[PDB]
């Protein structure tokens, strides 16, 4: 049964090096397009875009469940998917219009919305229940990520640095190339057929509600953007903002169609986590670049920490998180209180400016290790304590909401982000991070 | 000055990428062909294509030095070289037939036979004579290389084994395509004009020796190919010993044409410490499927140790390499005496047969551990030592004799390897290491 494990490994560590791999580049790219005249954005739109790139990315994964569960089949969507994520790739390395380069966001938003919540679907069916097993095959796919995130910028930043943007561009599409050439082709020989809709692929029953909402949600939206634009004209940054305002709507709407006291700022605490994994990619990105020296080695280079540091703590953390129990909910307050206290440390050194020679960058590196350290104590149990409070509020539309924290809380950077490229106001970007452990604090007492 | 360091980084990266990756499972795949009936070859004769194959390549790279030294630029000949390659790996993807399939060798020996000494000249030139650091970057360019050779197994492995060989060799021809997409966007900008023929680039002085060995060595070799024919017929493996001949008589003649007593043993010791080297790409290889299970991991992962001991080993050993000068040739003693003695590791198990549950495969980890320790002792060390006696008998073709031990290594691999793949008669196999430990003790005592 598991040898798809290995070949779901080469699928997802070559899907997420082309993912990773551009994502760490590519605000430096914009920043380029912007210096060269080629894009007429300001560097906190070009710095929000890549904060709605992560929430439009999370919020298609829900779509991609949905559409691959009851219209078109697992194998198929992770197929179609890929290749639709590969040739978003194609449009940045191949075109150069900023227009093309726009184009980009949108296939990779919509295949990895197919994609990433399919090909995980497929691991678990590569086990037909078997209890045990089960869970080590999904963790050594937790490692195909993390070697894949790690080692994209480690090339693709060396790819970007030494030769062109449009090359590492290409270098992240051909990565796609090798994750579709396996999976077509090793999946032939693994794939138990899941290549057509499961359960419901109903017909006469489904008809009705599907074009309701194509009707209803999507003509609804075309009818927003005719508004906006006979308002003034194409509004650049407030079109982000109705981003943001569907990515905070459908889980509000959800919030009060449904109904819980206690859930509530276990929700908000996890998209305020979110919001510090997603910022590592972006703020954190640019103070990288900002108040940090990189005399031989890459900048995008501190994009591969992140998963360094998961696929490290991950062993350490295992025999850790075992003995304790002896001595579930205590361990998400200790959680969004490591984000809190990571995030502190950029105001620390830049209110003291206390460095001398080469001490500087390690600042940054111990940042990250202690935003990871709040990642291993949120992303395990995360999953089982919204799981233990959803029978009481019946578990339909429940289990969706914690993977819906991540297009919240990068939903929530879209808006937040802007107020860290101010330059002149940075210390109080990160003298907000005290309010994450104010607030993770709260957790503690209840 | 040192940028170039991070483009031929990536460009031997993706060489010894797509040549060790192909290389681990080439072995497999011809047996694959042997098996479907498109191979007419026997299991020892394709084992011994295997080592011919790394002498052609080594032979060849003599000749790619000195035809881009003299006649075309170091820059194109690293380029063109690689697309021979990047071509060689499309005849394994590709072509299907043998016959293809052994035109894809001629181009991977033509090819690397160019790239890789070019593109370690090229490391130096970086660095106009800049003393302390020239070592640093060529210690640099060492790593690629390992990181390169290391990590292929386990994306080609895990590609064969869960989709075709095509498909494995497919990710090597991708991964040569990264070499030059980069290197030539690389180069661009970081090279600094060797892009045509430096000294001697000479014109009528060069004419008449150039043309010289057009008909007497080509012209020669092709009269000894109708020789064979016309003796019998296509005879396929006495084509390997005119290859073992031709490596064998090279250095040979250069030998007596140019005479020296302390060499002789030095040189047979290096001949006999490369014929280990490439015999764990085959000989190992093959007792990788024989003697060892692989129930879950795939048994291409072996080739991955060679060069993950040699990046591990090279920290350790940089501080035990200095202590030791206060309390050169001793250390070459050293040496064989670690090959002769991690070979004899073969035949203890294989005569005892002690092992039960999944105690097995740690025997073929120690022994490549063992032999590394024997590289560690010998290709730093080896260099300085030929140099050092060079003055004496003239340093002219005398510096070329270190690399050609690699060729004659293999060479002698060619006709060795085949009495391994006897099977029963495989005890004697390791017996022979024995050897290697008395023929070693000779040269501690001098």
Chains 1, 2 share one sequence.
Do not use: C
């Amino acid at each position: 049964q598991p040898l798809g494990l290995s070949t779901l490994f080469m699928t997802e560590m070559w899907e997420r090096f082309s993912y990773y791999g551009m994502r760490a580049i590519l605000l430096y790219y914009m920043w380029f397009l912007i210096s060269t005249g080629d894009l007429h954005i300001t560097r906190a739109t070009a710095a929000s875009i890549m904060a709605i790139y992560a929430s439009m990315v999370y919020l298609s994964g829900t779509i991609g469940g949905f559409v691959a569960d009851r219209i078109i089949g697992a194998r198929p969507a992770v197929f179609w998917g890929g290749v639709l994520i590969m040739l978003g790739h194609i449009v940045l390395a191949l075109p150069f219009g900023a227009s093309a380069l726009f184009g980009s966001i949108i296939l990779i938003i919509i295949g990895t919305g197919f994609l990433k919540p399919n090909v995980s679907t497929l691991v678990g069916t590569l086990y037909d229940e078997h209890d045990r097993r089960r869970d080590a095959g999904f963790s050594i796919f937790v490692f195909g990520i993390n070697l894949g995130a790690f080692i994209a910028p480690l090339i693709v930043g060396a790819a970007q640095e030494a030769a062109g943007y449009h090359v590492a561009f290409s270098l992240a599409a051909i990565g796609m190339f090798i994750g579709l050439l396996v999976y077509y082709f090793g999946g032939k020989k693994t794939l138990d057929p899941h290549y057509l809709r499961p359960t419901d692929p109903l017909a006469p029953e489904e008809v009705k509600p599907l074009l309701v909402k194509v009707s209803l949600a999507v003509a609804g939206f075309i009818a927003i953007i005719v508004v906006m634009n006979l308002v003034g004209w194409n509004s650049l940054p407030a079109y982000i903002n109705l981003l943001t305002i569907v990515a905070i709507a459908i889980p509000v709407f959800y919030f009060a169609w449904m109904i819980v006291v206690s859930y509530i700022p276990l929700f908000i605490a996890a998209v305020l986590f979110w919001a510090i994994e997603e910022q590592g990619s972006v703020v954190l990105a640019t103070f990288a670049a900002e108040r940090v020296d990189s005399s031989w080695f890459p900048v995008s280079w501190f994009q591969s920490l992140n998963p360094l540091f998961i696929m490290l703590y991950t062993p350490f953390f295992a025999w850790l998180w075992t003995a304790w129990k002896k001595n579930s909910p205590t361990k998400f307050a200790v959680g969004l209180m490591f984000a809190g206290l990571s995030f502190l440390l950029m105001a620390i050194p830049g209110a003291l400016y206390g460095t001398s020679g080469k001490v500087s960058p390690l600042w940054l590196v111990g940042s990250w290790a202690l935003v990871i350290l709040g990642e291993m104590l949120i992303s395990p149990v995360g999953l089982s304590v919204t799981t233990k409070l959803a029978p009481k509020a019946f578990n339909s539309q429940m289990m969706s909401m914690w993977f819906l924290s991540s297009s919240v809380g990068s939903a929530l950077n879209a808006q937040l982000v802007t107020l860290y490229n101010a330059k002149s106001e940075v210390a109080y970007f990160s003298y907000f991070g005290l309010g994450s452990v104010v607030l993770g604090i709260v957790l503690v007492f209840l």
